[PDB]
Amino acid sequence: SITQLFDDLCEALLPAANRKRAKRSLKKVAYNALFTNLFQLPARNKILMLSFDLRVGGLGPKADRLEELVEELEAVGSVLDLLVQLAGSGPPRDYFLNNKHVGRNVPYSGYDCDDLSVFEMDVQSLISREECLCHSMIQETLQVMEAAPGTGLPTVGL
Amino acid sequence: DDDIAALVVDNGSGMCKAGFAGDDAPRAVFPSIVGRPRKDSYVGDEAQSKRGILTLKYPIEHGIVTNWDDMEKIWHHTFYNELRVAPEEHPVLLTEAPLNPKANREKMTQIMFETFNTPAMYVAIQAVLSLYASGRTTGIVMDSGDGVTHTVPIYEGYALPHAILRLDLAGRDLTDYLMKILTERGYSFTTTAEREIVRDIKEKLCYVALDFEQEMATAASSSSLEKSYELPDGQVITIGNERFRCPEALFQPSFLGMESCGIHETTFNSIMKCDVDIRKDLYANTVLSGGTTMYPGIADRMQKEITALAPSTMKIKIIAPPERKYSVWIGGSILASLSTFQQMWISKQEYDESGPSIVHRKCF
Amino acid sequence: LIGKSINFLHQVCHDQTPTTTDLENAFQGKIDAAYFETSKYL
Amino acid sequence: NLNAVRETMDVLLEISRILNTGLDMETLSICVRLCEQGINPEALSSVIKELRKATEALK
């Protein structure tokens, strides 16, 4: 049944490691929220409206790819209608932009200093991310090395 | 628990289903036969096996309650054998066929408070409850089970009763028509047990034709519906042509000799008497339901007739459940879990203070 | 007395079927009710 | 058609990743099978978020 697929939704989104009483309560949670909206423009236009904010935030080829896929999926209508409603709450070189050394009859524009400077920032975000890992690995363990003994272990409860 | 557990007793036409809410499958399934001498207090298999000094009697045989003493008896055996629970710590949701009358409801709460002694209660329409299990609360529902049939339009979370169409079709009519055709085609047969077995064969093994014309031509050229069945006792029943005429009677209803509309005519007249402004909103989720899913091939004929029914300017969007045999039980179990459903749930206090008739007002 | 009935059903009938302040006196409530179900079911 | 609905299932994955939806492959398969029945997806958007809240309520 359709109400059985809602149990499988509870099965994927909660893995097992009790664990036989939580799933019926989550099944109740799955049923109780579905019918409040039911008591109380095309589809691809919203895709364009979301590609616009991408282009506002830079990052050209991602918008060019998002528009590329809906153009060939119209060349399943109800499932992308779910993705526009689930947007923004989940988990998320190249030498042909500012390197003019490769190509065939490369475009003549004089030189560059104004995107070559945002070609170091492309690496600077990575350099700022891989130091935040080591800030969050020294912190989780200095939270263990410094404490009054046995307040992170339940061994005092034995 | 943190509040007392809800209970559901579903008094169905063919079998009775009791259990606790918090589960999708029922706790106990008994037959609805009540043995009365030709035991003397036992409702179920033992009454059915001792039916040689006990005469036949059913509390619900039409699909609704047509014997109140008998229903109080199966309700009493429900309380003692099927439950033996503390009744004042268990609010109970009953379920009957679509559109309970007011006086029937008054009799229902009247005996529910004495034979059972419920602390709070609920009484419910069937097809809406079954729709709530299919994942919507608007739509048009053709509920044809082992009891009575209705094509219920429902929009705004409760059914529109001006266009609700009651249709006399039941499992009673099915077993009687099976006896008629099985003795009519030519065979030595009058006994009740093979009537039940061949009824199970028609329920599961028999083919519901997608159309009349195509299956007519296929069987007329060389009968492709032919199938043999080999029981433990050594029953031999075969021909495709008898299996082709057995469920044929709902395609054109005058094939049997009954006068009430067929499936396409009832659903067309039901969707016609429901308003045009909500017609397309209702037609965006039309549902299949009822116990007749014991063989999943009546759904094919249904969705072909529904796409033939409505104009081509709005196409079919029919939800076909991959299960609807336990539809009424799961309807109750999904409904009673909600917190907002508790506000329509009536207590014993109001039932004493303003008469029994308020159970028609608060619960509806 | 109730463990002499359930075991009896389990052993010679060969049926493994379903049979269905202080410490605040838990026992008296459950023992009697369990008897009133179980002994009748046998 | 069985050729086509595997490829459309594969292209359907990328636009669920780049739209930053919570779905991975398994939940995408559950949701495509659930929408195939005929349910309105704007309703499904709320039950998925309520499950993901009450899952964190345990841990």
CB–CB contact D52 A50 (8 Å):
no
Q: How many CB atoms lie within 10 A of CB D18?
A: 18
> In angstroms, how far is the first alpha carbon of chain B from the final one?
28
Task: Give the distance between the most distant pair of CA atoms in chain D.
Answer: 43
**Angle formed at CA B251 by CA B249 and CA B256, multiple of 5 degrees:** 25
**A106 alpha carbon, distance to own chain's centre:** 36
| CB contact set of B319 (below 8 Å; sequence gap of 6+) | A2, B134, B135, B136, B139, B285, B286, B287, B288, D37, D38, D39
Q: What is the resolution of this structure in A?
A: 8.7
Beta carbons of B145 and B115 less than 8 angstroms apart: no
CA gap D40, D27 in Å, rounded:
17
Query: In terms of domains, do B157 and B176 share one?
Result: no
CA gap B16, B32 in Å, rounded:
5
The domain boundary, picked from B202, B236, B260, lies at B260
3-state secondary structure A4-15: HHHHHHHHHHCC
CB–CB contact A24 B22 (8 Å):
yes
3-state secondary structure A26-94: HHHHHHHCCCHHHHCCCCHHHHHHHHHHHHHCCCHHHHHHHHHHHHHHCCCHHHHHHHCCCCCCCCCCC
Q: How many CB atoms lie within 10 A of CB A66?
A: 19
Chain A closest-CA separation from residue D38 CA (Å): 9
CB–CB contact B132 A35 (8 Å):
yes
| CB contact set of B340 (below 8 Å; sequence gap of 6+) | none
CA gap B4, B26 in Å, rounded:
18
Query: In terms of domains, do B304 and B162 share one?
Result: yes
Range of the domain at B177: 169-260
Query: In terms of domains, do B301 and B355 share one?
Result: no
Beta carbons of B42 and B58 less than 8 angstroms apart: no
Q: How many CB atoms lie within 10 A of CB B327?
A: 26
Chain D residues touching residue B319 (CB < 8 angstroms)? 37-39
Closest CA to A23 of D54, D34, B339: D54
Chain B residues touching residue A39 (CB < 8 angstroms)? 137, 157
CB–CB contact B337 A2 (8 Å):
no
Q: How many CB atoms lie within 10 A of CB B117?
A: 12
Structure obtained using: cryo-EM
**D54 alpha carbon, distance to own chain's centre:** 18
CA gap B306, B271 in Å, rounded:
11
Helical residues (DSSP H) of chain B, grouped into ranges:
45-49, 68-77, 102-111, 126-133, 171-184, 192-204, 212-221, 240-245, 263-272, 279-283, 298-309, 327-335, 348-353, 358-361
Chain B residues touching residue D38 (CB < 8 angstroms)? 284-285, 317-319
Please state whether at least 3 CB pairs lie below 8 Å between chains B and A: yes
A30, A62, A69 ranked by CB distance to D51: nearest: A30
Question: Hey, is the C-beta of A22 within 8 angstroms of any chain D C-beta?
Answer: yes
Query: In terms of domains, do B65 and B32 share one?
Result: yes
Chain A residue with minimal CA distance to B157?
A: A39
Query: In terms of domains, do B93 and B177 share one?
Result: no
Query: In terms of domains, do B110 and B190 share one?
Result: no
**Angle formed at CA A80 by CA A77 and CA A85, multiple of 5 degrees:** 130
CA gap D56, B48 in Å, rounded:
52
CATH number, position B318: 3.30.420.40
Query: In terms of domains, do B140 and B76 share one?
Result: no
Chain A residue with minimal CA distance to B287?
A: A2
CB–CB contact A2 D50 (8 Å):
no
The long-range contacts involving C28-33, CB below 8 angstroms and separated by at least 24 positions, are C31/C2
CA gap B123, D38 in Å, rounded:
29
* Phi/psi-derived region of residue A105, left when phi > 0, alpha when psi is between -120 and 50, beta in every other case: left
CA gap B119, B141 in Å, rounded:
32
| Chain A touching partners, 3 or more CB pairs below 8 A | B, D
Query: In terms of domains, do B345 and B256 share one?
Result: no
Q: How far is CA A65 from CA A70, A72, A84, A87, D11, in A?
A: 9, 11, 16, 17, 12
Query: In terms of domains, do B143 and B89 share one?
Result: no
Give CA torsion, residues D5, D7, D12, D15, to 10 deg. -160
Beta pairing class for B149-154 and B139-144: antiparallel
Query: In terms of domains, do B107 and B32 share one?
Result: yes
Beta carbons of A33 and D52 less than 8 angstroms apart: no
A6, A24, A38 ranked by CB distance to B138: nearest: A38
CB–CB contact D35 A78 (8 Å):
yes
Beta pairing class for B92-95 and B7-11: parallel
CATH number, position B212: 3.90.640.10
Closest CA to A9 of B20, B88, D51: D51
DSSP type of residue B184 = H
DSSP-derived 3-state class of residue B85: coil
Query: In terms of domains, do B276 and B339 share one?
Result: no
Q: How many domains does chain B have?
A: 3
Helical residues (DSSP H) of B252-361, grouped into ranges:
263-272, 279-283, 298-309, 327-335, 348-353, 358-361
Query: In terms of domains, do B37 and B111 share one?
Result: yes
CA gap B76, B79 in Å, rounded:
5
| Chain B touching partners, 3 or more CB pairs below 8 A | A, D
A6, A24, A35 ranked by CB distance to B137: nearest: A35
| CB contact set of B322 (below 8 Å; sequence gap of 6+) | A1, A2, A4
Question: Hey, is the C-beta of B135 within 8 angstroms of any chain D C-beta?
Answer: yes
